[PDB]
């Protein structure tokens, strides 16, 4: 995030700082929903960091005030940004795994958002069957 790397790179001495990653969302959603949205946002940021920034602001109206980090959006706008970020993550995973987005199932999409992977260099253990 642009608010963190610059801050730590120009910090000439070690120190400790506090942030509130849930800027004001807690006023309308429970902390469970806030954490889920935050982890989805960070997954998208780790994936692309460029298209994710674009999805963060859907319109020039959404302005990030200096008081906090994430842009302030309406509830439905938050829903749309969340679904767009989910589509981003699924499409990018498909790009690196040659798998269709529709090919993934609900549990599989949850696993990908969390960070599960599937690999098998030695499949000959199929001899169990």
């Amino acid at each position: 995030v642009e608010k963190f790397g610059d801050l730590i790179l120009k910090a000439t001495e070690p120190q400790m700082v506090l942030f509130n990653l849930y800027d004001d969302w807690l006023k309308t959603i429970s902390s469970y929903t806030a954490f889920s949205r935050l982890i989805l946002i960070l997954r998208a940021l780790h994936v692309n960091n460029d298209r994710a920034k674009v999805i963060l602001k859907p319109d020039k109206t959404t302005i990030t005030e200096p008081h906090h980090i994430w842009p302030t959006l309406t509830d439905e706008e938050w829903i749309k940004v969340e679904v767009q970020l989910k589509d981003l993550i699924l499409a990018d995973y498909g790009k690196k795994n040659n798998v269709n987005v529709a090919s993934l199932t609900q549990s599989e999409i949850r696993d990908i958002i969390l960070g599960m992977e599937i690999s098998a260099p030695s499949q000959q253990r199929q001899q169990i069957a």
């Binding site: 959603i29 929903t33 949205r37 989910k86 609900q106 999409i109």
Partner: protein
């Protein structure tokens, strides 16, 4: 006569009615007339019911569960609000207009106060007579306040407790009995400095015995 029932029978009847309703709903679901019930989801219940799908789009899930909670809450509220409007309605006409069943017997309490020169006590007595719908009259004379109140038994019991405990020179009920019909009109006051005018006003409705008993009580208080 109406018959009560023991707490055991009350519990059994309520349990039977609830079980009947639950079986009715379940068999309605069996026959397809009713959709299968949806899980009741709250904020704590969210990640347990919709855990595999809240990671897809958490804000939509939050909106859905809050909509369900608000739907339940608003379903509860409508009936309550309608029946509270029912409260206003009755309270002004069916929950506060009783009259104590004064049809076959009118309880008449005639008291004789010594000092009633304060208009605030007379205004409070008139407000208590008008709020409880109790008829009667009040006669004023030289160190004499003959207040007769005829009405229901509960209204007379409220008026005696208001005049003996809630109102302060001493007030004592001179004649507390029952009558066949009503004799005095609305709650009004009549100032009579002479005893003959008060006696004629009491004998105009046939209640000169109360004024005679008040005069005898005043004579017995002034003698001893």
């Amino acid at each position: 006569l109406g018959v009560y029932l023991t707490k055991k029978e009350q519990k059994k009847l309520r349990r039977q009615t609830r079980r009947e309703a639950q079986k009715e709903l379940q068999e309605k679901v069996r026959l397809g007339l009713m959709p299968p019930p949806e899980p009741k989801v709250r904020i704590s219940n969210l990640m347990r019911v919709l855990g595999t799908e809240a990671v897809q789009d958490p804000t939509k899930v939050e909106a859905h569960v809050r909509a369900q909670m608000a739907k339940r809450q608003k379903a509860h509220e409508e009936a309550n609000a309608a029946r509270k409007l029912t409260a206003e309605q009755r309270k002004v006409k069916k929950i506060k207009k009783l009259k104590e069943d004064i049809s076959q017997g009118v309880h008449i309490s005639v008291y004789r106060v010594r000092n009633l020169s304060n208009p605030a006590k007379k205004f409070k007595i008139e407000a208590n007579a008008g709020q409880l719908y109790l008829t009667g009259v009040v006669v004023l004379h030289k160190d004499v306040n003959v207040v007769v109140v005829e009405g229901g038994p509960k209204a007379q019991k409220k008026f005696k407790r208001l005049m003996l405990h809630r109102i302060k020179n001493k007030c004592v009920l001179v004649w507390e009995g029952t009558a066949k019909d009503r004799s005095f009109g609305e709650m009004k006051f009549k100032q009579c400095p002479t005893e003959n005018m008060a006696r004629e006003h009491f004998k105009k409705h046939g209640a000169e015995h109360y004024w005679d008993l008040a005069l005898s009580e005043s004579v017995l208080e002034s003698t001893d």
